């Protein structure tokens, strides 16, 4: 009679379908998912330093909008801007807003050092009902609204050397009065001019008088500019009117910092990978949660699922 | 009657991925082969370790959603991102297809290796039934079957008996 | 004697060469081409809505060049601009022409709604011999050339609220007179200014007086600008001269529309994939016809041919 | 004399991709094997269905030809497009090389599978001539050859005759 | 005792990649097989010729290092380049892994092909010892061994002797 | 007794580790490196035409800084700018410097043709102590500093047609005086204006009077602009003061030329692939020397090594 000896392999009743080169669908004994498709719906506060902008855009925290005073000098790995954020100070715009926002975000610090600019012969610390701070008329914390004194506005020609070992970022602006009358009432003379220069740059701005739609009852505007001053260089401000002067400089750092638009709440938890939807686990190589990411993250793909076989072909009995 | 790996798997083998079923004069049984099982598992763990927990840090990038219409610069930012996503999506699709092909090939390979190894132990003393099974032409008790499974089977011990059985009319 | 039984496979007398990993060239029994290398030399009018620009650029159709009157209010999936197209109205330029062209192209509509701007105290509907419509001096259909009335140009300060559920696109401009004389003759006063603003934007333009080379006998120029007004916002035009005023707004849509430069004729046929050379079949995964495509198209590659084996190795007898 | 698949194909087999040639006491002939043929064809159709008629819609993109010199922005637009085209061209080249490798492997595999299947039917009754052919050591008429081709051949019917022929001096 | 390719290579074979060791009544020796050796080498040279000396010319591109902070445009230039480098780095990693897999497979394949070819020459006259070696059951002097290595061995010459040896008790 | 015949393969005592799909590390008999990781530390002068900028940026060679006179009319495949380069003429800036640098670099030629502009009623060939040439006050070689003559600056209105078969590149500028006094002393009238136009373009520039930090004792600045004039078009310069006039045009070519920042010395040798570190061999498909390359170069990757197996698995005895 003898014996019979048969070689075989296992099989399972509940197999899973995968794709190979040979087959669009083949059942295997087991598989694992390579596409992360869910977030936990909150941005974990660890291990990255999160700064929740709350009602403040980064630019409003920079200029010093009154509701953003709590942000002075803070640092971040990720600044989170909320869709509800709104400005509540003198109405302004920033030509190339997106670039100023990007470079501050990437710098990752609001550290500000005050400097003593020699502003002789003008009225300082101008304020407005459009920018209320603790019940009083006020202004952007980091800017100095200069106007005429004793019906005169003597031409400004002020220098600030950078004798530090780091770059200085200066934020300044131009007031665009609503009428030719207001130009006179504020600055003495019928047309202002601003020239801000260094050894390696110059920026020249002329105000544009006129009506804009009222924002917090103000039909005029401020336009914001910026200037970087390297070590051994000099800021030179030369102006016959309309200057919204800097009070000092922001430190500008380089590193890994960024900014993200999200309405997800901040949670007390620890997760490497952040998306606008919330933190996501980063065990899988791919993800279809969001193309916007910060940190050690799976790569964004369009597939909602990719199954990697972790067992042999399943051939039920 | 018992049957081999060509045409089906064994749902009743729960303690291994590959193994042996036998019929002899002491009964019928099953035993997992741990070496072949482990060889497949190690390779699959090898893949998993390359693909899992290996993400790449990125920090400040470009914007990818826009509240206002702008034209040229925004067209470019969008096209750069779309381009990138399509290329990664392609890489992911191909990678999984190639990996899964290789997994099916390596797991099929361990089955074939175990079969061939068994065939080469038995030699002369058995016939390949074409279905993953061997007909062994000598008395082969549980210890004998065990010796085949453990790679200690000496075909010379049974050769006389086996040939006498095969080549009688 | 017995028998002999041999196993074999087919072979063909006319095999084809393919590339594998193992071999740079191996003959197989059959192959298929994966690179589409030809067009039918015409752009099929189906299934995409084609708008043939003929003598008109999209921007000339937008502004309302007299030869483009037929285009009023039309929509497209693909606007086709011809190399022969030429302007035939007041000579103009568009700072960031490429962006205005892109955003209208992508919007996919020339739908225009007239509005009643309060232009009191000026002469309206200015025209020129540079822009002939049905034998008479004329102007861009969608723009209103305002000039002095009774030797006066009273400052304009006009509002237009957007109370719709969609965005409004306004096209307007500035006339740059050839001489200081002409500045006076047209606008009363020696220097014009234009300020166009919303709650979220402002644009200020000063004309630049001077000679440019004559185009249709005109040595002056118009420069074109645009402004988007969202729902609940307001257009505010404030000007002391030189304004080329809007007559209303274009609807701005989002969707799948585009623009393509091509001289291929439009044909009565149906093809998904369009290139500048003409429509191409889209059965193959790749193509080397043109990097510029619209629709469901094969991907552009540099290879002129890629052969996919569809049979076994060919081993002749 | 007839010869197997090692070293050449058969231009005269027009009704199948794989098959059998025989010589016996009733003559010489050829027959296609439809199963192996179909297995190869189905796999190749599988590939084709993944690659053919599967294009991707794109709409408004960036400009790719320029009538004026501009510098920085145009340099970037051009570099983005060149980058993209080179990456797709690479993907296309690799994909076709891998696909074609796999096609040659799967078609070679069906030949080997058919040969092995035949070997395992004949067993004991035939010798592998090393050239894709078997010498069958018993009378095997057209019905017998047919039974091998159809997988209904019982080697036990001919074993006595076959062994008697092989192991005579 | 001499041993085959299953479980180790031969550091003493310096004149070929694949070959034969024998023991007979004239002694013990080694000989390289030039055909199998050359088949592997040609394939590897084939790969090398596709990858070596095949670079691509590029000329004016985008800037990739920046002395000043600029924001949006620079963010985009940087992201485009980072994107490109990551995609090429991935292509390089995959390509080398796939190429190296294929090299190991093609070199293993030439070993298996040589073994099978030898098995099919010997047939009936030898037994596969399961370790890459054959026990040949007839006197096989240096000329005989040579005839196996050269593919001119006729098993019919030795069959009577060989079977007489194998199937005696 | 019989014989024994064993099949085998070679093995080596010194194998190398490679990666496959099956294994993260497997020892093979031999491998070759696919990542070029070294340069020879010099830029070979063959087979590409190298132009070493030495103390000159490309823009300074273009404008004609006195230390760059040796560069007149030269061509290159690759212009190499050195980190030590410095300007030594009238202090200037170029709005969109990066674009002018790119387009000249890509053009690959400094060929300049002088033209006779009709500058009647002004003083020509203005010079400065900031720009010394052979011990005398001088100016940019390719620019003509025009100032008042006999206390008058008669308005300029000068034409230059392009009757050639190629494009002309014109470089010109605007002088920004330090004070309103100097505006008068140099140009007669209290405000200058420049309008440079063609049939297809216009550029209007107003000087901005003011102090900038001193460079070579000069607190004023020049701002540089450019204009391309196609065949059959016309350059039209219309100016009432402050024009830094062109002396002619640069030829503008298209081809394979570029510019590279490097401090590597130029060597007498022959190498196809150039990086900032020096020339690199181009036998390997990849390289991790530099992402910046010119010529037939391996592709930049992040890996420092990629080993391609060139032999079988190594299994020692
Ligand atoms: C050039 O064109 C622009 C655009 O139209 C004109 O700008 C308008 O100017 C008028 C007059 O200065 C502005 O009207 C004022 O609005 C203020 C803000 O009101 C807000 O809150 C109320 C709720 O009570 C809302 O209804 C309203 O929508 C606003 O959100 C008021 O504070 C002002 O009130 C004054 O007048 C009323 C009576 O009319 C009195 O009862 C008050 O006590 C007070 O004296 C006033 O109503 C209007 O807002 C401006 N529009 C825009 C879009 O900015 C310029 O005036 C015009 N220039 C010239 C020179 O003509
Ligand atoms: C500042 O500098 C600019 C640039 O040179 C000057 O612009 C030129 O101005 C002159 C005079 O106004 C222009 O000349 C005029 O050209 C008109 C168009 O002619 C076209 O058609 C004819 C065919 O007949 C072609 O030959 C020609 O090339 C054009 O395509 C004519 O209609 C005008 O004709 C008048 O004069 C002639 C006699 O000279 C009479 O017969 C006519 O009846 C008629 O009165 C005239 O010829 C010239 O085109 C302008 N050039 C450019 C490039 O625009 C400015 O004049 C100058 N400013 C100052 C203040 O000096
Ligand atoms: C608006 O604000 C700006 C910014 O401060 C002022 O610009 C300064 O103007 C002053 C006066 O014109 C400049 O001072 C001059 O510097 C020249 C260059 O000196 C260089 O070399 C010396 C070495 O000897 C270095 O120490 C120095 O750092 C420079 O590198 C000198 O040549 C001038 O010398 C004159 O004065 C001295 C005595 O003070 C005499 O001994 C000399 O003979 C000679 O007469 C002078 O020192 C200064 O450089 C400017 N600063 C900048 C940053 O540009 C504007 O003046 C101001 N405008 C108004 C209207 O007030
Ligand atoms: C009806 C109207 O328009 N009235 C405004 C006035 O216009 C006159 C018209 O009434 C009249 O019909 O026609 C006249 C011509 O003949 C006039 O055009 O113009 C003044 C401005 O000059 C308006 O007053 C302003 O109203 C503001 C309300 O939002 C506010 O009260 C302004 O005061 C502040 C402020 O808080 O914003 C006071 C600040 O201390 C001051 N800061 C500084 C540093 O000077 C600012 C600042 O001057 C402005 O913000 C600059 O734009 O103003 C008040 O001046 C009047 O409503
Ligand atoms: C020789 C010459 O340059 N002549 C032009 C004249 O210049 C004088 C010189 O002849 C003389 O040597 O020196 C003088 C100084 O002492 C003068 O500079 O200037 C006038 C313009 O003021 C020229 O007349 C214009 O010629 C046009 C021909 O292409 C055309 O006929 C102009 O009329 C229209 C037009 O159709 O373009 C008439 C339109 O109704 C009018 N529209 C409006 C809304 O007002 C336009 C518009 O005024 C202009 O297009 C604005 O740039 O003009 C005609 O005014 C003369 O040739
Ligand atoms: C102390 C001072 O600032 N002095 C400068 C003078 O300012 C006066 C002050 O001293 C005084 O305290 O207050 C006064 C007001 O009441 C004055 O503001 O202004 C003059 C310029 O007008 C300065 O002289 C210039 O110094 C230069 C030294 O770097 C140089 O010598 C200038 O001459 C050239 C030059 O080489 O750069 C001579 C060239 O031939 C000339 N070229 C042309 C084509 O005209 C140039 C050119 O005029 C300027 O470069 C234009 O910016 O100037 C010399 O004019 C004095 O130091
Ligand atoms: C950069 O800074 C410098 C230095 O501060 C600055 O120069 C100054 O310019 C002002 C304004 O032009 C000068 O003051 C004027 O001097 C001229 C000289 O003739 C007069 O015409 C002016 O008189 C008018 O304005 C007076 C104002 O009250 C009226 O009283 C008179 O009736 C006239 O309307 C006026 O006095 C000043 O002299 C210089 N300062 C020095 C030290 O030279 C320059 O303007 C600044 N540049 C910019 C772009 O801001
Ligand atoms: C935005 O719109 C507002 C509102 O329309 C507008 O304000 C207006 O400005 C004009 C021009 O400046 C004003 O008219 C002037 O009033 C001043 C007041 O002193 C006078 O100096 C002017 O006189 C000169 O011009 C007259 C023209 O005929 C001559 O007769 C005289 O001899 C002088 O040369 C002139 O009368 C007008 O009063 C205001 N309107 C109101 C309601 O306040 C503003 O200009 C616009 N802004 C822009 C940027 O367009
Ligand atoms: C482009 O080129 C054209 C042609 O050259 C040019 O036109 C010229 O403009 C100048 C400056 O405006 C004109 O000269 C003026 O003519 C007017 C006419 O009333 C006068 O008001 C001016 O007088 C003042 O300046 C004189 C200077 O000495 C003083 O003596 C006098 O007291 C006044 O202060 C002055 O004479 C000139 O007539 C025209 N030329 C022609 C042929 O028409 C235009 O300016 C240029 N455009 C640009 C943007 O540069
Ligand atoms: C489709 O059109 C493109 C663009 O016009 C053609 O490519 C050009 O071909 C001409 C003539 O050979 C060359 O001089 C240009 O350099 C090419 N341009 C580009 C951008 O590559 C292409 O040949 C056409 N293809 C077909 C199939 O008609
Ligand atoms: C085979 O190994 C198993 C290990 O559990 C052992 O139980 C059995 O007795 C062994 N038999 C032989 C013949 O080696
Ligand atoms: C070979 O020839 C036949 C008949 O002419 C043709 O139909 C077939 O397409 C050809 N095949 C190849 C791969 O060239
Ligand atoms: C084999 O199958 C074919 C099908 O056409 C049939 O003609 C033949 O008789 C069959 N022979 C046997 C022995 O099953
Ligand atoms: C085998 O070939 C080798 C070639 O060197 C030769 O020396 C040997 O004699 C040959 N032997 C036979 C039996 O063909």
From TrEMBL, chains B, D, E:
Disulfide bonds join 140-144. It comes from the Viruses. Glycans are attached at residue 150. It is found in: Host apical cell membrane; Virion membrane. In natural infection, inactive HA is matured into HA1 and HA2 outside the cell by one or more trypsin-like, arginine-specific endoprotease secreted by the bronchial epithelial cells. One identified protease that may be involved in this process is secreted in lungs by club cells. Belongs to the influenza viruses hemagglutinin family. Homotrimer of disulfide-linked HA1-HA2. Binds to sialic acid-containing receptors on the cell surface, bringing about the attachment of the virus particle to the cell. This attachment induces virion internalization either through clathrin-dependent endocytosis or through clathrin- and caveolin-independent pathway. Plays a major role in the determination of host range restriction and virulence. Class I viral fusion protein. Responsible for penetration of the virus into the cell cytoplasm by mediating the fusion of the membrane of the endocytosed virus particle with the endosomal membrane. Binds to sialic acid-containing receptors on the cell surface, bringing about the attachment of the virus particle to the cell. This attachment induces virion internalization of about two third of the virus particles through clathrin-dependent endocytosis and about one third through a clathrin- and caveolin-independent pathway. Plays a major role in the determination of host range restriction and virulence. Class I viral fusion protein. This is Hemagglutinin. The gene is HA. The chain holds residues 350 to 518 of 566 of the full protein.
């Amino acid at each position: 009679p003898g014996a019979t000896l048969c070689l075989g392999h296992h099989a399972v009743p509940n197999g899973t379908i995968v794709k190979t080169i040979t087959n669009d669908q083949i059942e295997v004994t087991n598989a694992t998912e390579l596409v992360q498709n869910s977030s936990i719906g909150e941005i974990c506060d660890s291990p990255h330093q999160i700064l929740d902008g709350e009602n403040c855009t980064l630019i409003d925290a920079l200029l010093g909008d009154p509701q953003c005073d709590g942000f002075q000098n803070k640092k971040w790995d990720l600044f989170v801007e909320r869709s509800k954020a709104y400005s509540n100070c003198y109405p302004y715009d920033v030509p190339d807003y997106a670039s100023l926002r990007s470079l501050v975000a990437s710098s990752g610090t609001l550290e500000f050092n005050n400097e003593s600019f020699n502003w002789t012969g003008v009225t300082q610390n101008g304020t407005s009902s459009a920018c209320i701070r603790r019940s009083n008329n006020s202004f952007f914390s980091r800017l100095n609204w200069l106007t005429q004194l004793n019906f005169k506005y003597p031409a400004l020609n002020v220098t600030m050397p950078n004798n530090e070992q780091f770059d200085k970022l200066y934020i300044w602006g131009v007031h665009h009065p609503v009428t030719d009358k207001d130009q006179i009432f504020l600055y003495a003379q019928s047309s202002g001019r601003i020239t801000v220069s260094t050894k390696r740059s110059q920026q020249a701005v002329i105000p544009n008088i006129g009506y804009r739609p009222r924002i917090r009852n103000i039909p005029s505007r401020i336009s914001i500019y910026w200037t970087i001053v390297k070590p051994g260089d000099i800021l030179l401000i030369n102006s016959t009117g309309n200057l919204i002067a800097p009070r000092g400089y922001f430190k500008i750092r380089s590193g890994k910092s960024s900014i993200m638009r999200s309405d997800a709440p901040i949670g007390k938890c620890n997760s490497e990978c952040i998306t606008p939807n919330g933190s996501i686990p980063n065990d899988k190589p791919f993800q279809n949660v969001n193309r916007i990411t910060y940190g050690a993250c799976p790569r964004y793909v369009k597939q909602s699922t990719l199954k990697l076989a972790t067992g042999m072909r399943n051939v039920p009995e | 009657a018992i049957a081999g790996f060509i045409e089906n798997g064994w749902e009743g083998m729960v303690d291994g991925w590959y193994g042996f079923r036998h019929q002899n004069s002491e009964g019928r049984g099953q035993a997992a082969d741990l070496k072949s099982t482990q060889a497949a598992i190690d390779q699959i763990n090898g893949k998993l370790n390359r693909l899992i927990g290996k993400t790449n840090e990125k920090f400040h990038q470009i914007e990818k959603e826009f509240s206002e219409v702008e034209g040229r610069i925004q067209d470019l930012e969008k096209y750069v991102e779309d381009t990138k996503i399509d290329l990664w999506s392609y890489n992911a699709e191909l990678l999984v297809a190639l990996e899964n092909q290789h997994t099916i090939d390596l797991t099929d390979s361990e089955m074939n290796k175990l079969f061939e190894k068994t065939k080469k132990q038995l030699r002369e003393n058995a016939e390949d039934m074409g279905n993953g099974c061997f007909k062994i032409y000598h008395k082969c008790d549980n210890a004998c079957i065990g010796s085949i499974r453990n790679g200690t089977y000496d075909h010379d011990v049974y050769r006389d008996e086996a040939l006498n059985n095969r080549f009688q009319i």
